[PDB]
């Protein structure tokens, strides 16, 4: 392959990024409510969720190393509240011009 190479195509844009939220302000900070699949509602400005690097408009894949693809706001909310200190939540984000 002097000029190019197979496979190169069909690249990967978005990637699985993990982010934790430190519950230390009127709750956790970020708000999430939906029906499996679960998604993000909105992020608080200047909070533990945002500062850490949590962006809204994302889909919750697995929480605290647990599958939540078929979980509902209630089902999940229960797991989150579990740890009043901090909790780990994984989501899928696309690094690009993604507007909104």
Curated annotation (Swiss-Prot):
Annotated compartments: Cytoplasm; Cell membrane
Reported tissue expression: Detected in embryos from E8.5-16.5 in cortical ventricular zone, dorsal root ganglia and cerebellar primordia. Isoform 3 is detected in testis and in spermatocytes from newborn mice. Levels increase and reach a maximum after 21 days; after this they decrease again. Long isoforms are widely expressed.
Chain segments annotated as transmembrane: none
Disulfide pairings: none
Post-translational modification summary for this protein: Phosphorylated by cyclic GMP-dependent protein kinase. ISGylated.
Residue ranges constituting the PDZ domain according to the UniProt record: 18-94
Subunit structure: Binds the GNB1-GNG2 heterodimer. Binds EFNB1 and EFNB2.
Function field: Down-regulates signaling from heterotrimeric G-proteins by increasing the GTPase activity of the alpha subunits, thereby driving them into their inactive GDP-bound form. Down-regulates G-protein-mediated release of inositol phosphates and activation of MAP kinases.
Name by which UniProt lists this protein: Regulator of G-protein signaling 3
Species whose genome carries this gene: Mus musculus (Mouse)
The encoding gene: Rgs3
Entire protein: shown range: 18 to 94 of 966
């Amino acid at each position: 392959g002097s000029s190019g190479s197979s496979g190169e195509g069909d690249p990967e844009n978005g990637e699985k990024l993990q982010i934790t939220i430190r519950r230390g302000k009127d709750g956790f900070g970020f708000t999430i409510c939906c029906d499996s699949p679960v998604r993000v509602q909105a992020v608080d400005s200047g909070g533990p969720a945002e500062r850490a690097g949590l962006q809204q408009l994302d889909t919750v894949l697995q929480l605290n190393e647990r599958p939540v693809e078929h979980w509902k706001c209630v089902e999940l909310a229960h797991e989150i509240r579990s740890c009043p200190s901090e909790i780990i939540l994984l989501v899928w984000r696309v690094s690009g011009p993604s507007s909104g």
